[PDB]
């Protein structure tokens, strides 16, 4: 085995070992228990974020759609009044509401100075694609009566990021304007590929083991019996979706099983002619940045951030 | 160990071949008889370079500008329209030793073939016989005699490997000697800072695994090239300086993602983003150091795109 990356602070080592501790005992399939043990850890990050960023929460519901807006406490930044970012959390597909939702939410509202409207969609294994692109789509739907399509971003990670890819192709769907720009940040609409599930140990390598050929779909049961040839549920896979998919901000930690299946989205929208940014964070593991006492998640939160602010239209609307 | 894993499940069958050959041609231990270790990868460039001329139409001129060898390779249907104000300076990789010749050839014709630009290779002074900043000097002297008929704008510098580290390093010099910046460069496999992170463990340039408790990594680059210079010279590793990383040009870091040099290349990414400078990272999984030597896969072609494309991008046009 390795050291931790030497690239690291000492911060972000002292996270890892938190990292380490928070982890999931086996739940083997026990969904209830499973939601329990993610609703505690989700607020476990709340806490942490409320202690470094200051912002304020409100509910809403958009076109029938309960959301979560999140702002800098004293309120949005001049340069990011007429735009706004949405926020799908992550969680599987089968958790993340509420509290993980706004530990996604608050960093960036507060990084950027800018509202965040994190929408608490339709969960697995209860709902099954695509409910959760409808859900994004209502939402977006409904910010387009007060924000130019152009000002409007969508983010999220792990599943949240898938959900944010598929969202795009369901609101094109819909024949509404495509957002200015997107984060599939931790997973976009594409399988796990490549070397790295094998590197953070999602699937078992190594001496006496078998290892075993990847999936070429995701395996949550939210996506089940969607083929892979749907090019909205699997948009980074289809050269048509990606033609016209908007700009991309894709990031992830060194260590996630996400990043092989990332850099291939990144040179797939770059052979397409979108403007993509890949980021990778060396040492650093899946949906790193909700845990915000490092300097390595300020700067991930920093990058977020400079994509929206260099991609998204200014204009009023 | 990357060893334990199945290829990457993303590559084509011709790149699978092609990294069963890399295997099955790699270096045994030369212990030290440089004659012999040149001889070796004088033969594999030579290999390479039948492999070139295969899939890409070019021709070469040699030249000598500022008292500098170079080997000026063109598309044989000529530089398009588009790129007759532009040039590309290519600095080779071999391990700051080898590589002149047929090595820099590698290099420079498939993206002379593939952007429709002229490239100019540069036969820069070799280590161990000679020491930085001699590669930087070569180049600048280069880069100055281009000045001559193309707008600094106009003229991007790549190289992968050594010849990565030396375009970064390139860069500094050409900025202590008071000439504009290059309108863009490409640090492949390579950029002007030490192997770093996670990458050198899994690609096994350190011992790594059960029984065996892995050593620190240096914080210098261990080449000969590069001896006695210090960690704190930000002429020598800019891109862990912020104050060169500033001045940096648009850049493009690229690489195989089992190659050592990745977790380097991705912490230099996200220095340059945090310093203001437009820059770009692919990574193709699966595939080793230095891979886009090796022409006869899709992801070689891929790649070729990826640096003509940038350099198409970023570089001016006007005369
Ligand atoms: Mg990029």
Avoid at 168 to 175: A, F, L, P, Q, S
Avoid at 179 to 192: E, F, Q
Avoid at 216 to 221: D, N, R, S, V
Avoid at 277 to 297: K, Q
Wanted: glycine share 10%; proline share 8%.
């Amino acid at each position: 085995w390795l050291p931790p990356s030497n690239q690291l602070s000492p911060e972000a080592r002292s996270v890892l070992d938190r990292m380490d501790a928070a982890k999931a005992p086996e739940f083997n399939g026990d969904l209830v228990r499973q939601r329990a043990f993610y609703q505690q850890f989700n607020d476990d990050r709340l806490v942490e974020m409320r202690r470094v960023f200051r912002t304020r929460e409100r509910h809403e519901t958009l076109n029938a759609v309960h959301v979560q807006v999140v702002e800098p406490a004293d309120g949005v930044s001049a340069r990011n009044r007429d735009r706004v970012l949405i926020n799908v959390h992550g969680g599987a597909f089968m958790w993340g509401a509420g509290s993980g939702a706004l530990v996604e939410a608050i960093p960036i509202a507060a990084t950027m100075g800018v509202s965040v409207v994190t929408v608490d969609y339709r969960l697995a294994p209860e709902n099954r694609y695509p409910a959760a692109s409808e859900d994004v789509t209502a939402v977006y739907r409904a910010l387009l009566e007060r924000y130019p399509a152009a000002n409007i971003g969508i983010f999220g990670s792990s599943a949240g990021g898938v959900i944010t890819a598929q969202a795009v192709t369901w609101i094109r769907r819909e024949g509404l304007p495509r957002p200015g720009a997107i984060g599939t940040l931790c997973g976009t609409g594409a399988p796990y590929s490549g070397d790295s599930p094998y590197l953070a140990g999602v699937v078992p390598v190594g001496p006496g083991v078998k290892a075993p050929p990847l999936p070429g779909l995701l395996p949550t049961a939210y996506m089940e019996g969607v083929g892979a040839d749907d090019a909205r549920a699997y948009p980074l896979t289809s050269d048509a979706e990606t033609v016209f998919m908007p700009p991309t901000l894709l990031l992830a930690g060194g260590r996630d099983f996400a990043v092989s299946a990332l850099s291939l989205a990144h040179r797939r929208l770059a052979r397409a002619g979108v403007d993509s940014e890949l980021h990778l964070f060396d040492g650093l593991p899946h949906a790193f940045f909700v845990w915000p006492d490092m300097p390595e998640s300020l700067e991930a939160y920093a990058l977020i951030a400079g994509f929206f602010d260099s991609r998204l239209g200014l204009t009023p609307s």
